[PDB]
């Protein structure tokens, strides 16, 4: 009665909703720098998840309460119809918090909305959060120090992080973030075939192998980027194409 | 040249405002217990500060928003012809936070409104904050654990606290808080003569010497209360009667 190769049923009529929160600028008083190139990430993410069958929903620079209000809705509608749920955060962040346009929001209160008790129709289904968030200071490469704790949240949750403690995230102003770029390239090629954690492992390598060129910037030599992911999943996750 | 006996000029035509924020009950979502007896404290403080020449203003169970607007109004009106400013907080509190009816406010946010730069009519003038606040759990004596950090606020600020860390606050459902009772008694007898910090030291002794019967509570025997005060005053403070 035990299957070492057991998979999440990706049978349902719909793949599910992919939520993306894109944050480009911030409230004057938060004194946080712009994140140029985040729109490129947004669009890249939009195309790749659509191709995987997701109902992509994008929101730009929502205020804390707008964002909360919106995600709370998506948690209180039925997903009984779908395979899984995806939520992406593209902003600045610190410790346990991520930044909405004007205020900090605790990641745990964002994922908590989708736990087994608050969201019955996702019980047993993969809940995947992807976080490109760090601390702020033609194509320019900006370098930001890791800030967001790479924590997990709940059963069947999968937290994917652009960078781990002691490392630095990178964002090109035109092509977007290294993490996002690489993640989206793996999705395009292997998204509909590879087990999803194995794929993220591919992203780990692709990003970690990225160097710079000594002359692009004097202040960015040896600031390597190593992403990571915290898995709470209980089965194998594939995104084979739906009929 | 230098006056070791130097005192705050208290010869302004008005003494000043006494701001009392009274909170007896709270928003259900805060799960904070009622504070029976806080009205007795309010009424006591009101008369003792009136007799000292203050213009007392009591506000009951205000929400964070109305409270902030209201204190910001007092902070922006002229105190040019006043001796000082008094603000009292009666409510639950925790760490650096006090509670308004529906949300918590930082004490530093409240005190910050009256600092040298932000309030000009009060510069060089004694700014006195009195805080009866702790952690929530016929006459009855209730015991609450010390929870509010006892910190200073800035130059010419006098921060007065009902209880210090590791001790317990007490409030009688009819008579009111030990701290407030003892403070008001000292104010009544010595308020218009004694130097105010020395009068607080008296209050330290009176409260620290208080005991419960141990005949009405088995669940409070040995829980002593010792107040404290953080002074950043720069001169002697007296409330001698005005002409």
């Amino acid at each position: 009665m035990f299957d070492p190769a057991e998979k999440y049923k990706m049978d349902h009529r719909r793949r599910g909703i992919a939520l993306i929160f894109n944050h480009e600028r911030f409230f004057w008083h938060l004194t946080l720098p712009e994140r140029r190139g985040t729109c490129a990430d947004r669009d890249n993410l939009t195309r790749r998840f659509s191709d995987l069958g997701f109902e992509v929903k994008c929101f730009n620079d929502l205020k804390a309460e707008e964002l909360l209000l919106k995600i709370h809705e998506v948690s209180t509608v039925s997903h009984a119809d779908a395979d899984c749920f995806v939520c992406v955060f593209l902003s600045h962040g610190e410790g346990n918090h991520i930044y909405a346009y004007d205020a900090k929001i605790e990641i745990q209160t964002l994922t908590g909305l989708f736990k087994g008790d608050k969201c019955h129709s996702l019980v047993g289904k993969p809940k995947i959060f992807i976080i490109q968030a760090a601390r702020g200071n033609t194509n320019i490469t900006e370098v930001d120090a890791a800030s967001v704790y790479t924590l997990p949240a709940g059963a069947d949750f999968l937290m994917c992080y652009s960078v781990a403690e002691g490392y630095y995230s990178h964002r090109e102003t035109v092509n977007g973030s290294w993490y996002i770029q690489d993640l989206c390239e793996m999705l395009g090629k292997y998204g509909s075939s590879l087990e999803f954690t194995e794929l993220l492992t591919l992203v780990n390598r692709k990003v970690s192998q990225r160097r710079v060129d000594f002359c692009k910037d004097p202040s960015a030599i040896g600031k390597k980027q190593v992403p990571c992911f915290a898995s709470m999943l209980t089965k194998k996750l594939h995104f084979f194409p739906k009929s | 040249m230098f006056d070791p006996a130097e005192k705050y000029k208290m010869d302004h035509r008005r003494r000043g405002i006494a701001l009392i924020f009274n909170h007896e009950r709270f928003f259900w979502h805060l799960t904070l217990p009622e504070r029976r007896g806080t009205c007795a404290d309010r009424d006591n403080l009101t008369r003792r500060f009136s007799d000292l020449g203050f213009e007392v203003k009591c506000f009951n169970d205000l929400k964070a928003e109305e409270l902030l607007l209201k204190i910001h109004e007092v902070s922006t009106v002229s105190h040019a012809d006043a001796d000082c400013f008094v603000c009292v907080f009666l409510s639950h509190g925790e760490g650096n936070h006090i509670y308004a009816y529906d949300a918590k406010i930082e004490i530093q946010t409240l005190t910050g409104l009256f600092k040298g730069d932000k309030c000009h009519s009060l510069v060089g003038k004694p700014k006195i904050f009195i805080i009866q606040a702790a952690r929530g759990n016929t006459n009855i004596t209730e015991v609450d654990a010390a929870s509010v950090y006892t910190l200073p606020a800035g130059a010419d600020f006098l921060m007065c606290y009902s209880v210090a860390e590791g001790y317990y606050s007490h409030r009688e459902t009819v008579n009111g808080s030990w701290y407030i009772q003892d403070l008001c008694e000292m104010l009544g007898k010595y308020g218009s003569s004694l130097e105010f910090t020395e009068l607080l030291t008296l209050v330290n002794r009176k409260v620290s010497q208080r005991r419960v019967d141990f005949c009405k509570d088995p669940s409070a025997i040995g829980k002593k209360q010792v107040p404290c005060f953080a002074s950043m005053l720069t001169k002697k403070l007296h409330f001698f009667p005005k002409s």
Binding site: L68, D102, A103, K104, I105, T109 | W28, H29, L68
Partner: peptide, 12 residues
């Protein structure tokens, strides 16, 4: 003016 630094989602 006024600013919320933390929002929660109420149960009722």
């Amino acid at each position: 003016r006024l600013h919320c630094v933390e929002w929660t989602i109420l149960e009722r």
